[PDB]
């Protein structure tokens, strides 16, 4: 079953899908293909939880019924700057305006 994801770091957001049965490491390989940084230089997170390479996305709570096309689940990303890993940091999206009166 497909899960639909947003992989987020700083002001970058990747929209992609993966199998529930695929692994965290395999998701790093996908990020590698896009952002050109190897898996050993990536940490992936569900909220503040560091995800282990050998776990399946399903095990880590990304399921086909919650990680939906129209409402994808967020996976946090942090890169290793040279020696040590930066802290997970995801820039929020902008804020919508106040509802007008007429609405």
């Amino acid at each position: 079953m497909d899960v639909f994801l947003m992989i987020r770091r700083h002001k970058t957001t990747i929209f992609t899908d993966a199998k529930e049965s695929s692994t965290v490491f395999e998701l790093k390989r996908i990020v590698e293909g896009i952002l050109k940084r190897p898996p050993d230089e990536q940490r992936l997170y569900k909220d503040d939880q560091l995800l282990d390479d050998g776990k399946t996305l399903g095990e880590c709570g990304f399921t086909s019924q919650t990680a939906r096309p129209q409402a994808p689940a967020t996976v946090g990303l942090a890169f290793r700057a040279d020696d040590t890993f930066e802290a997970l940091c995801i820039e929020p999206f902008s804020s919508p305006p106040e509802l007008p009166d007429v609405m």
Binding site: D2, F4, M6, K11, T12, T13, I14, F15, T16, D17, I34, R68, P69, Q70, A71, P72, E91, F93, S94, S95, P96, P97, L99, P100, M103
Partner: protein
């Protein structure tokens, strides 16, 4: 193959090329990064979700859920969809 769509506040959304070609406007701007000076991230993120939704549920027998739009973003989203022709 992916393209980068950049919001007016500098958010970089990386989505599959074929998904982004849902918008004829984006096709033209490509024909592989596009800046959108009038589309903020809270709108453009939703547009990307729309692409994913459309591609997934077009020509599909499995029942179709409603594409959700918060009241707060509906106006700006309308304006983006009109510009993007999607």
């Amino acid at each position: 193959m992916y393209v980068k769509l950049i919001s007016s506040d500098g958010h970089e959304f990386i989505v599959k090329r074929e998904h982004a070609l849902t918008s004829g406007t984006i096709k033209a701007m490509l024909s592989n990064e596009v800046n959108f000076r009038e589309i903020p991230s809270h709108v453009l993120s939703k547009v990307c979700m729309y692409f994913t939704y459309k591609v997934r549920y077009t020509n599909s027998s499995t029942e179709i859920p409603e594409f959700p739009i918060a009241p707060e973003i509906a106006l700006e989203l309308l304006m983006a969809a009109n510009f993007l022709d999607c």
